[PDB]
Amino acid sequence: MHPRFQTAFAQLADNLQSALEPILADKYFPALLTGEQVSSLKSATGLDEDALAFALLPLAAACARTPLSNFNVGAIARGVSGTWYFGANMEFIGATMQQTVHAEQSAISHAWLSGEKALAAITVNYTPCGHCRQFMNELNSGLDLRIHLPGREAHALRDYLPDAFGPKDLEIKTLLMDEQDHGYALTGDALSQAAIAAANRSHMPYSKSPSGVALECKDGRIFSGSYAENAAFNPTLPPLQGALILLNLKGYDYPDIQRAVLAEKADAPLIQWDATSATLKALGCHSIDRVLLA
Amino acid sequence: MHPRFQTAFAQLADNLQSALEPILADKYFPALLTGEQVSSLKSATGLDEDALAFALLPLAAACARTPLSNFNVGAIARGVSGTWYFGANMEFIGATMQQTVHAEQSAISHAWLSGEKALAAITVNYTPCGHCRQFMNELNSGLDLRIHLPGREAHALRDYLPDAFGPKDLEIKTLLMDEQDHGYALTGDALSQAAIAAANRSHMPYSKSPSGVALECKDGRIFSGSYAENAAFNPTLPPLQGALILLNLKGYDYPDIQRAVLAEKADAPLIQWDATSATLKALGCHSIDRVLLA
Ligand SMILES: Nc1ccn([C@@H]2O[C@H](CO)[C@@H](O)[C@H]2O)c(=O)c1
Ligand SMILES: Nc1ccn([C@@H]2O[C@H](CO)[C@@H](O)[C@H]2O)c(=O)c1
Ligand SMILES: [Zn+2]
Ligand SMILES: [Zn+2]
Numbered sequence A, B: 001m002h003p004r005f006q007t008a009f010a011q012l013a014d015n016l017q018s019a020l021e022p023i024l025a026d027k028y029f030p031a032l033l034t035g036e037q038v039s040s041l042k043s044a045t046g047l048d049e050d051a052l053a054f055a056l057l058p059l060a061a062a063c064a065r066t067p068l069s070n071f072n073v074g075a076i077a078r079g080v081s082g083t084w085y086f087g088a089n090m091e092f093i094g095a096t097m098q099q100t101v102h103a104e105q106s107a108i109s110h111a112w113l114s115g116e117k118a119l120a121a122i123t124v125n126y127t128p129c130g131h132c133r134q135f136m137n138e139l140n141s142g143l144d145l146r147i148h149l150p151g152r153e154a155h156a157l158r159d160y161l162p163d164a165f166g167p168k169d170l171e172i173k174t175l176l177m178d179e180q181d182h183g184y185a186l187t188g189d190a191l192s193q194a195a196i197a198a199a200n201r202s203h204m205p206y207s208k209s210p211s212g213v214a215l216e217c218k219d220g221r222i223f224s225g226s227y228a229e230n231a232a233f234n235p236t237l238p239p240l241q242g243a244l245i246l247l248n249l250k251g252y253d254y255p256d257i258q259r260a261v262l263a264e265k266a267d268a269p270l271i272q273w274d275a276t277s278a279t280l281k282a283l284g285c286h287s288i289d290r291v292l293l294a
Helices: A003-010 A014-020 A035-045 A049-061 A103-113 A130-136 A190-200 A239-249 A273-283 B003-010 B014-020 B035-045 B049-061 B103-113 B130-136 B190-200 B239-249 B273-283
Strands: A074-079 A084-088 A119-124 A146-148 A211-217 A222-226 A257-264 A288-292 B074-079 B084-088 B119-124 B146-148 B211-217 B222-226 B257-264 B288-292
Touching (some): A014 A035, A035 A049, A049 A074, A049 A084, A074 A103, A084 A103, A084 A239, A103 A119, A103 A130, A103 A222, A190 A211, A190 A222, A190 A257, A190 A288, A222 A239, A239 A257, A239 A273, A257 A273, A273 A288, A273 B273, B003 B049, B014 B035, B035 B049, B049 B074, B049 B084, B049 B103, B049 B119, B074 B103, B084 B103, B103 B119, B103 B130, B103 B222, B103 B239, B190 B211, B190 B239, B190 B257, B222 B239, B239 B257, B239 B273, B273 B288
Parallel strands (some): A257 A288, B119 B146
Antiparallel strands (some): A074 A084, A074 A119, A211 A222, A211 A257, B074 B084, B074 B119, B211 B222, B211 B257
């Protein structure tokens, strides 16, 4: 078991510990559970889906990286496929408050990046901030997404964001998690191609600036992040954060990032290069290359 | 009249145009109205405060800088003093979506930076995004701040952000717009001292990293911005944005920024230097110095 899960797991109910212990055995447990795995957990405990999601929030919160706040928040995004994706918040010393990722952004990006086509609900152990309510309104699930919070009745997103602003207001009809492929040819080495492929999936209807970052670990594992804009602009998830969300949830740590590549257009109205370099250098990576899309 | 106001003013009601025309005569009208001025406007038109604020939103929206969206939004923050501060959204080509300022952030920062101690209401011509609802919950006005939107009943912030996250959740008791003075000695030239004084007012309870940016214009006018953190971290207003909000609202343009200074601690957990330099270079300023606080 990856040590981050040790105390969380110790606090779990006996029959749940028993059902999970095979799954969490592996140090690189992918912070995700398939439909088959949630069925097993339900049979071993008698918990229904919403109660199981709440019981599991301590393992999601165990993936939080919180050097400034020490306020660990876990979220679980339940895909329409039946897969459950964990998510946790990350704060980066040496960067700015704008580089923070929230537990909800982590869980939704985990699902989108894994190829999930839509979400049915998200369970979080603390009420969503307004920045994440706005993030969630970018999704193809719209205001109907169900939010589950400890000790409250479930509600759709429309209840947490009354009289909402979102894509419709700027006449945008392609929503985050819809099928997007921008068609750039992949070139370069493995890492450059991962970065361009990530850029090909980006949600960027407002600036039309596609980008993707790919991180190569010391053991050769690659983690890629696509750019996801938001109608309120600032809740946008930068490309780097996607890659870092996956790296952390899959069991790795910043010390084993070996090199990174950012792919983007040179003439794009928004430029990710400076924030990507700066945050990666703050994390200790110094091998950052940029690939240009055409 | 500063040309940005020309079409907006032309669309105004005759008795209102008459009352405003002395005020808007000056090219450097400070995008603000004193209590005495709103009284005059009420006597000249018969409008009450809320209706006057709505009638004036076209002049606030006229200060928007929107190269990506062309979606101009104006806001008017009504101080507890009786002064009304305009605010408009700004988007910066060559930067990232995280550098955007919303009309609400612009109007609240205009008030805070001008020395306003608290707000009574804010009027916006489009419903607030969740990022700004969270920004507004940082204020000493809390969830009681009144939001006025065209064609809707006024509501407190608690109605737009049900089951809100905010300072209380992280045990913070000093709120934005409360009296803060961090006590750094001012040194250096006029610009360095402006930057350190701005840093002395910053709201930074979560990272304890004070910062302030000061911009010197070609005619020697200085504009300073203090750093304002937010409990949800990402809605934080960077120091640069404060300075740029004031520069734009007071009638200037990016071409006349001559040099800038950023003041901050070297050992602070969050660092503003890279995003400040990058965005200012995107705007064309290349003379950026950093001053260290001790
Ligand atoms: N519902 C919440 C509330 C806060 N946070 C985060 O917790 C910390 C303090 O706000 C930051 O990391 C921020 O992203 C969450 O992710 C989820
Ligand atoms: N109520 C709103 C809605 C959107 N915006 C902004 O309008 C643009 C498109 O979202 C961006 O500049 C963004 O900051 C506002 O400021 C106010
Ligand atoms: Zn959040
Ligand atoms: Zn906003």
